[PDB]
Symmetry: C2
């Protein structure tokens, strides 16, 4: 058998669909959560500072949960052995990981290791996002089987708001370094649930390739669909990684437009 690394982009986020005002849309006059569209999720997990810190840490939409579940179900069907799961500290990523594991039927067996070293390039994230993350206890209370004992390659408070592209790609290389060295003897698939950028930044170091030019890289991160996947396998006898077809198919689906019949006909 061949050891594998499957890098997975998170499912659809609520703010991709509902835009910058999404949080004000689902907050009642009295400050409570409600669903003004069915693509808002059933609930939000409990957090520090109430509903207000979801600002730069949006959850999956109902469609994004579906995508994540559909991919976990396909993984179950495929027969592949999944041995570890690492997630970006971003809520959307931990949730995608949770839903994949639930459909693998492994949510109890495998703990999600939260790795800030595979968080988004800080350039593209709010400066105060480092301070936005759900803590591991908050996640645990919200029913996320998070590895409380995992020691990240890059702790969340070491993320630098002004990290350059060069610094970004380096800390992804180092994180993947540690991830690969957890137990180099395991022979199943490790999941890396992260951002569009990770499908490049987390695989190129494994492939022994130089970082992509920043501009080419920026154009590539636009092209990865929700739950988009990239799969690397290690050759046992020479220790070399190669890109191969992921163990499951792509997911292609249409949009659903906003609609009100009574409005429409006036």
């Amino acid at each position: 058998s061949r050891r594998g690394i499957l890098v997975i982009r998170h499912g659809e986020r609520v703010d991709q669909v509902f835009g910058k005002s999404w949080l004000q849309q689902c907050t009642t006059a009295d400050g409570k959560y409600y669903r003004p569209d069915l693509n808002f999720p059933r609930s939000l997990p409990r957090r520090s500072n109430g509903i207000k810190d979801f600002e730069n840490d949006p959850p999956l939409s109902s469609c994004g949960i579906f995508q994540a579940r559909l991919a976990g179900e396909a993984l179950l069907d495929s027969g592949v052995r999944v041995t570890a799961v690492f997630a970006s500290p971003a809520l959307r990523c931990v949730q995608t990981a949770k839903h994949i594991l639930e459909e693998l039927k492994l949510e109890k067996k495998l703990k999600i290791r939260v790795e800030p070293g595979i968080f988004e390039w800080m350039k593209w994230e709010a400066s105060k996002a480092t301070l936005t993350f759900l803590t591991l206890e908050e996640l645990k209370e919200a029913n996320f089987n998070v590895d409380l004992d995992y020691r990240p390659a890059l702790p969340r408070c070491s993320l630098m708001p002004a990290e350059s592209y060069d610094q970004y790609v380096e800390r992804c290389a180092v994180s993947m370094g540690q991830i690969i060295n957890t137990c180099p003897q395991d022979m199943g698939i490790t999941l890396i649930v992260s951002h569009s950028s990770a499908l490049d930044s987390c695989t190129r170091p494994l492939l022994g390739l130089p970082p992509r030019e920043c501009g080419d890289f920026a154009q590539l991160v636009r092209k990865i669909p929700s739950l988009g996947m990239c799969f690397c396998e290690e050759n046992r006898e020479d220790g070399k990684w190669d890109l191969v077809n992921p163990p499951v198919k792509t997911l292609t689906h249409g949009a659903n437009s906003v609609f009100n019949w009574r409005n429409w006909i006036s």
Copy 2:
């Protein structure tokens, strides 16, 4: 207050993968595979073989998700669902089933197949080459259909090619029956059908004449999957009011075709 909720079927495999979708998921000798996750995990068995899916396609995976999300929202709304009628098109019976599953009512309420609320057979892409699953086939494939329900229109009667004026009369005829089938006991009746039905199954209830064909078509083409139209009955005043549906709308984005080879290297 007695309500009627008209609901368009979820996303169809052929909306996303085109008319050749069946070629994409079947092997030389008719074996089904799943080339993309939006193809369903299996196809039910058909009397005249898979070829019949070309004019009677199933829901995509996204369509199933849409149906289930609406069922789950209906349950959360607290409304009481009395009855469920569905068009004989496979996509409609599938949408009905998945709604009922999330309402947790699929053992309790039987789906009543009504050929009278089938699509407009002018727009319909065929001639005399459309065959629905029989009730027996549907029950075989685990749809809790009502074997004892007597339809307003028999499926054999479906005039194989129709104009606009014929379609709207038929829908009005059938809705008359459906309003008479149900016992006086209120709650909500689900009518799982096509996008054209949100107008053609409501205008007759509202005592309203049909729209000019261009005006109808223009409005109808913009109904999304699981799009809803809701009419409540004023029993003392003997007439129907078009009202806000008991569940919110569903907005989501697409997921585009991805080829890792084109990008990751």
